[PDB]
Amino acid sequence: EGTLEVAMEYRTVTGVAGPLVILDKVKGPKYYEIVNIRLGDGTMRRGQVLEVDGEKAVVQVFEGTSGIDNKFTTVQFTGEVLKTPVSLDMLGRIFNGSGKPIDNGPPILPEAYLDISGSSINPSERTYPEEMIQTGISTIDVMNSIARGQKIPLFSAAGLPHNEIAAQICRQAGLVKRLEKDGEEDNFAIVFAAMGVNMETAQFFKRDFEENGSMERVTLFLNLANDPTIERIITPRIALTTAEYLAYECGKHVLVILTDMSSYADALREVSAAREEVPGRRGYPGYMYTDLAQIYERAGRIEGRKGSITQIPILTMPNDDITHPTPDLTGYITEGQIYIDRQLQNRQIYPPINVLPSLSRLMKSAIGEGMTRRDHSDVSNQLYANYAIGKDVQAMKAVVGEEALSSEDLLYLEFLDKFERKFVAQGAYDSRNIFQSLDLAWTLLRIFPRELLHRIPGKTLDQYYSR
Amino acid sequence: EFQRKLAESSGDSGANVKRLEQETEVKIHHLNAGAEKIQYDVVQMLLKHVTTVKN
Amino acid sequence: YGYVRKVSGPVVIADGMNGAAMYELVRVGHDNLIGEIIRLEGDSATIQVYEETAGLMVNDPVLRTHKPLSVELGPGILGNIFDGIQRPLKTIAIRSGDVYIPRGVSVPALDKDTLWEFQPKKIGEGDLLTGGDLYATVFENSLMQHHVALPPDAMGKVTYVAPAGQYSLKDTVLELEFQGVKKSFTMLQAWPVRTPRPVSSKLAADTPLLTGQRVLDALFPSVLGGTCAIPGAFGCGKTVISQALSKYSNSDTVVYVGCGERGNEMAEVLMDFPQLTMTLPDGREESVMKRTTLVANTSNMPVAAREASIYTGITIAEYFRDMGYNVSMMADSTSRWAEALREISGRLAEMPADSGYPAYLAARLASFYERAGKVKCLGGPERTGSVTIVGAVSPPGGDFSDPVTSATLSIVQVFWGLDKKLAQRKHFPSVNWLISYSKYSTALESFYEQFDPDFINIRTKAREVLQREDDLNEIVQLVGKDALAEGDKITLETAKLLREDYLAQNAFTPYDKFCPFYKSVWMMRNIIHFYNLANQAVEKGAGMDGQKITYTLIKHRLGDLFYRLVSQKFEDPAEGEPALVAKFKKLHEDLTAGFRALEDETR
Amino acid sequence: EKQVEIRKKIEYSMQLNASRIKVLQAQDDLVSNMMEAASKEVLNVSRDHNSYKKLLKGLIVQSLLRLKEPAVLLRCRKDDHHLVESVLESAKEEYAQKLQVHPPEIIVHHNAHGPSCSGGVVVASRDGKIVCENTLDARLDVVFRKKLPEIRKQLVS
């Protein structure tokens, strides 16, 4: 505070293996101190100190390690942790992985520097997700709904249109309370962070956001596949810090779309392997759970502020499974799971969301008579049961023949057909009102007689079984 | 009707562009005035921080 | 004293320790982070930091404390929320206006300035007192009294006991003299987090848990001081069972220590339990926050804090059992705890074992679980109290081959194995009755006999019916119900009725919010009596047909009794036992009228 | 017609983005003017010859205390080299007073050109492995970086 000290500059780069440069004969080395590397050519890269030991210190480099020499490579210890500048002007701009602006504009003029991995929120100050946001997609709205401050990861496999449905959610997300909801603060101020994305996907998201008229609202941090791998382990943290500043300290509802968390697990694997650490499941680092918790638990409404953070981190299973460590840990941590199945895609339904594997822990809070129809929970719990039992019936009929099925079996099969065709499918640009979705669900349910509707209570039946 | 609608849209777009240009000019003027007002104090503070050493 | 050498993740190697014993808590850096020793190599000692390690220097001072991980006990421990290292969260949020938890905050675990009322238990001057003797009682809050006891490592003659009145923890409420020297005692009591509290002798449990849910309390019971394990499932499980064990259980208090779980779920729990007006007393609606305690440590919390959270939770259980209450501790952790062990073991460069988990995982889980069990307390008066450990296991997506699951099942006595298939079908209590078990079924013989001398037989009959149905489900999956005879058909009808009436429960309505034992046993007896009478009728074969013809006869001309049986779940418990018992006795009489009236005209 | 009006809305949004980007770029240009003025003032500070020596002594003391190395090799501009040569052993005496250590064996030769230096010293250690750049131009752009949020907070209007 009194007087400053200009950062030291070294040259003792005694070891360079992969993405790690191993400095030596260093003094006063901070942990996670951000370093500046000036090569012999004069280009400047930026790195981080993964480990400090005695006089040595191991430094990973974001922009790669394609030119370091033991003689000329200068490294400089800034003596501080990462601090991404943040300002209200950060809305409506597109950025590189580490925060450098790529919109041909000027660099951010900061309102303040906020250290990455922001300060932990005391649980005695959080509040449960109260309000519900309308996702547009009917399957999400009727079962597995999303409340403000939720963490819903979309589970997908290679080739499925997870990016398309993410864009649809970004275009269609909005409040639901009594169908009443300018709303500039109600505008979700989407912060999109893409890691390891094919350039076609980045162009697609850019064009969709530009066309939807949200270019003055959304914000993009991109870490393309050709871009250096290490920046993928910083980009989501930068995005979450920016979201935290835009929501908690500015009072804007914020929505976050982390893309290809498997492309983040890959960065974790590369870093862990480069350090010769003890591996975990499938060779992933033993602390992948801690990192995923640190990257997910930074969303949720806060009591003292009017803001909120609701993130939808999409995920790509490697071989289309769940036992893989990354989707498994994500399911452990996150409060939801939306499943996109290859079977539905093979049958050509644009939203391939398999409603049976789906789950939302906070579903019972978002719905209710105060903000939804009183029958919403009943309707959902019945459709789920009939779909599950009908699927069992279809599996049985696959071996016993269509003739051996009973009348209830035929009813269940017809319910499955109309559910997978008329209900799940929805337009790529057409939304569905929550009440319209419930009306469609009731039309699907009314195939069965009143006797078979075991889950639905008679009180809700009387007001809805006829309509 | 369509020709009238497109003509009205073009007129509204021109009006919005002119309003944006005027607002931009006003903003630039305000920022330049503030910078001119506060430049000397800013530079004095910067030099005071630079030109001090402790121990 | 000592200085840092190496900083990698949460593992810090500080040189110059020399005489620094294992697990001797040390304080690291200028920010003064808490931290426990994990390994030694000479003048240097490994430390776990329990906090973010970003910003540690080299030659940054580390101070030793000579004390292992210790949690501060005493009045006011109930109804609070503590971090894994036992920091009062609400105190931090109020004392510092910042909504965040600042790095390296130093706040006492219990407030040292609140005025507490002191009621000495007739202890006279010059009297002799000993470890755990209960010399004074303090009403921490209404409907939950807090006895004050001497620490187990204390004894002496009572030279001075404070009089009744308002006291604070900084004051000396009692004085003792022993072996020619005197010692003082305050209302605080610090205890190492490990090294469980001493017990005069353990005991064999006899009282059941009698939890709210019908399946748990009837099919797979647990005893007070028992040991359970659910697979930490959501929607079901971690929410409905937690609510039942917290607000609808006979345990005198609750200790929720669920760590390593979602932050939104923790906020929901911590915002819903404040109201939670459970009728724990006979005629009072006191909120259960005057009865429970949270040791919440979210997933984003430092990896090294999971074990600390678990052990502080079980230590708090012990303080209450020692006073006399039958505490029941629920741990949504032990799924993230195994991950914490893997993280620390790998970082400490330990050699992994089967499936990568540390070889000593079973030892740690045993050292945790075996602190359960009802126990005859220390000191005077004679007393008894118990601790229940209803832990968590990996969700039903992995088989029992999981090392954490195998280790738990090698120790845990009662397994409430929830199945994901039931969760898909939206069966909300979701206990799979084929794979669950309860080794306590033999000790509860006395209680079952005294409550109802015929419950064991009806329970065995229900188990046989369920097993028979699950057995012939495969045969039906091949051939179909065409070949099913009268006995098979009636068995499947009774199994379906049991599955949808008995084994289900909504828990969001007064019909199934809390099912007392009498109502559950009456449902079981009614269903089993119907099954037995129907089997006898179809075995009679009167009217030259009997059999499946008689089955259709009782399902059509006698189906009103069947509908009343399947609707018996809706008997409102608020009507009281003398009313519901009469209603069920009338239904039983009507059922006995059937299968005799049906046999009157020989079908 | 729908896509025409959608394209018109997109064009309006693009124009709004262009206007706001122009405003932001003008803001950055003003910040650059501020930095240029600060650099000019820093250069003007070198005109002094009495307090300038005290500042140089303070800078060399700070750097030598930060290195805490047995043998540094200070490098100073050819202009005002006389001032450094005059202060000489005063810095060594101050450092030896700071802690019970033998006086460093400083060495002072090649100098960078004035505008590159603009005052300040580069101290470094033997073999140049560890370098401390206490140039005035180096003290600036660090104070600037730290105080930039305060600058924006000062630029309310």
Q: Which residues of A touch B54 (CB under 8 A)?
A: 2-3
Q: Which of A354, A332, A355 is nearest to A344 (CA)?
A: A354
Cβ separation of A125 and C58 shorter than 8 Å? no
Q: Which of B2, B43, B49 is the closest to D1 by Cβ?
A: B2
- The CA-CA-CA angle for residues C129, C134, C135, to 5°, reads 70
At a CB cut-off of 8 Å and minimum separation 6, what does C600 contact?
none
At a CB cut-off of 8 Å and minimum separation 6, what does C36 contact?
C23, C24, C25, C26, C47, C48, C50, C68, C69, C304
Helices and strands (H and E) in chain B: how many: 1, 0
The response to whether C112 counts as a known ligand-binding position is no
Task: Provide the 3-class DSSP secondary structure of residue C368.
Answer: helix
At a CB cut-off of 8 Å and minimum separation 6, what does B18 contact?
none
The response to whether C238 counts as a known ligand-binding position is yes
Cα distance from C602 to chain A (closest Cα, Å)? 31
In a mutagenesis test of the D interface, which of B27, B50, B52, B55 is the best target, namely the one with the most D β-carbons within 10 Å? Answer: B50
Q: Which of A117, A120, A333 is the closest to C262 by Cβ?
A: A333
Q: Which residues of A touch D149 (CB under 8 A)?
A: 110-113
Q: Give the Cβ contact number of residue C382 at 10 Å.
A: 8
Rounded alpha-carbon distances, angstroms, from residue D19 to A57, B22, D14: 47, 10, 9
The response to whether C232 counts as a known ligand-binding position is yes
Q: Which of D34, D42, D58 is the closest to B42 by Cβ?
A: D34
Cβ separation of D24 and A216 shorter than 8 Å? no
The answer to whether A301 and A129 are in contact (CB under 8 A) is yes
SS in 3 state form for C534-560?
HHHHHHHCHHHCCHHHHHHHHHHCCHH
Chains adjacent to A (≥3 CB pairs closer than 8 angstroms) = B, C, D
User: Nominal resolution in Å?
Assistant: 4.0
In a mutagenesis test of the B interface, which of D2, D30, D32 is the best target, namely the one with the most B β-carbons within 10 Å? Answer: D30
The response to whether C559 counts as a known ligand-binding position is no
CA D7 to chain centre: 49
Cβ separation of D61 and B55 shorter than 8 Å? yes
A74 touches chain D (CB under 8 A): yes
Tell me how far apart the alpha carbons of residues A169 and A134 are, in angstroms, rounded to a whole number. 9
In a mutagenesis test of the C interface, which of A25, A51, A115, A122 is the best target, namely the one with the most C β-carbons within 10 Å? Answer: A122
The answer to whether C428 and C505 are in contact (CB under 8 A) is yes
Give the DSSP H/E element, type plus range, for residue C403.
Answer: helix C403-409
Q: Which residues of D touch A216 (CB under 8 A)?
A: 13, 16-17, 20
Cα distance from A4 to chain D (closest Cα, Å)? 8
Cβ separation of A2 and B49 shorter than 8 Å? no
Tell me how far apart the alpha carbons of residues A153 and A258 are, in angstroms, rounded to a whole number. 9
Q: Which strand ranges, in their side-by-side order, compose the sheet holding C165-167?
A: C144-149, C134-141, C116-120, C165-167
The answer to whether C597 and C561 are in contact (CB under 8 A) is no
Tell me how far apart the alpha carbons of residues A423 and A379 are, in angstroms, rounded to a whole number. 13
A4 touches chain B (CB under 8 A): yes
For tokens 């079962």, what's the residue?
A143
- The DSSP call for residue A432 is -
B15 touches chain D (CB under 8 A): no
Cα distance from A237 to chain D (closest Cα, Å)? 21
- State the alpha helices, DSSP H only, in A198-261: 199-211, 235-247
Q: Which of D23, D59, D155 is the closest to B24 by Cβ?
A: D23
Q: Which residues of D touch B46 (CB under 8 A)?
A: 38, 41, 140, 143-144, 147
Task: Provide the 3-class DSSP secondary structure of residue C588.
Answer: helix
Cβ separation of D24 and A213 shorter than 8 Å? no
Cβ separation of D130 and A210 shorter than 8 Å? no
* CB hemisphere CA count around C445 (13 angstroms): 4
Q: Which of A91, A142, A143, A81 is nearest to A113 (CA)?
A: A81
The letter for the amino acid at C124 is: G
Task: Provide the 3-class DSSP secondary structure of residue C141.
Answer: strand
At a CB cut-off of 8 Å and minimum separation 6, what does D27 contact?
A106, A109, B31, D155
Tell me how far apart the alpha carbons of residues A96 and A187 are, in angstroms, rounded to a whole number. 24
Cβ separation of B9 and D5 shorter than 8 Å? yes
Cα distance from C138 to chain A (closest Cα, Å)? 27
Tell me how far apart the alpha carbons of residues D58 and D52 are, in angstroms, rounded to a whole number. 10
For tokens 């009943």, what's the residue?
A378
Q: Which residues of D touch B39 (CB under 8 A)?
A: 33-34, 37
Q: Do chain B and chain C touch with ≥3 beta carbon pairs under 8 Å?
A: no
Helices and strands (H and E) in chain D: how many: 7, 1
The answer to whether C150 and C133 are in contact (CB under 8 A) is yes
Q: Which residues of C touch A54 (CB under 8 A)?
A: 5-6, 58
Give the DSSP H/E element, type plus range, for residue C157.
Answer: strand C156-161
**Shortest CA distance from A4: residue in chain B:** B53
Identify the bridge partners of residue C376 per DSSP, sorted by sequence position.
C201, C384
The letter for the amino acid at C576 is: G
Q: Which of A6, A10, A89 is the closest to D134 by Cβ?
A: A6
Tell me how far apart the alpha carbons of residues C296 and C263 are, in angstroms, rounded to a whole number. 9
Burial of A401 (0-12, 13-18, 19+ CB in 10 A): exposed
Backbone angles phi, psi at A327, to 5 degrees: -60, -35
Q: How was this structure determined?
A: cryo-EM
For tokens 């052990």, what's the residue?
C311
Q: Which of A52, A280, A333 is the closest to C6 by Cβ?
A: A52
- The DSSP call for residue C138 is E
A106 touches chain B (CB under 8 A): no
Q: Which of D119, D121, D127, D117 is nearest to D108 (CA)?
A: D121
The response to whether C234 counts as a known ligand-binding position is yes
User: What secondary structure does DSSP assign to C503-523, as a single string?
Assistant: S---SSSTTTS---HHHHHHH
Q: Which residues of B touch A216 (CB under 8 A)?
A: none
**Shortest CA distance from A26: residue in chain D:** D130
**Between A and B, how many CB-CB pairs are < 8 A?**
6
Tell me how far apart the alpha carbons of residues A29 and A77 are, in angstroms, rounded to a whole number. 8
Burial of C332 (0-12, 13-18, 19+ CB in 10 A): buried
Backbone angles phi, psi at D7, to 5 degrees: -65, -35
What the block records as the tokens of D74 is 């200070």
Tell me how far apart the alpha carbons of residues C268 and C265 are, in angstroms, rounded to a whole number. 5
- Whether the bond between C102 and the residue before it is cis, its omega within 30 degrees of 0, is no
Cβ separation of C55 and A298 shorter than 8 Å? no
Q: Which residues of A touch D25 (CB under 8 A)?
A: 105-106
What the block records as the tokens of C347 is 């970082």
User: What secondary structure does DSSP assign to A373-407, as a single string?
Assistant: -TTHHHHHHHHHHHHHHHHHHHHHHHHHTTTT--H
For tokens 């000036």, what's the residue?
A38
In a mutagenesis test of the A interface, which of C33, C92, C300 is the best target, namely the one with the most A β-carbons within 10 Å? Answer: C300
The response to whether C388 counts as a known ligand-binding position is no
- State the alpha helices, DSSP H only, in A275-375: 288-296, 325-333, 342-346, 363-366
Cα distance from D20 to chain A (closest Cα, Å)? 9
What the block records as the tokens of A355 is 């409603």
User: What secondary structure does DSSP assign to D7-56, as a single string?
Assistant: HHHHHHHHHHHHHHHHHHHHHHHHHHHHHHHHHHHHHHHTT-SSHHHHHH
**Shortest CA distance from D59: residue in chain B:** B53
What the block records as the tokens of C54 is 């970003």
Task: Provide the 3-class DSSP secondary structure of residue C360.
Answer: coil
**Shortest CA distance from B53: residue in chain A:** A3
Tell me how far apart the alpha carbons of residues C205 and C375 are, in angstroms, rounded to a whole number. 9
Q: Which of B24, B39, B53 is the closest to D55 by Cβ?
A: B53
Tell me how far apart the alpha carbons of residues C386 and C373 are, in angstroms, rounded to a whole number. 6
**Shortest CA distance from D68: residue in chain A:** A27
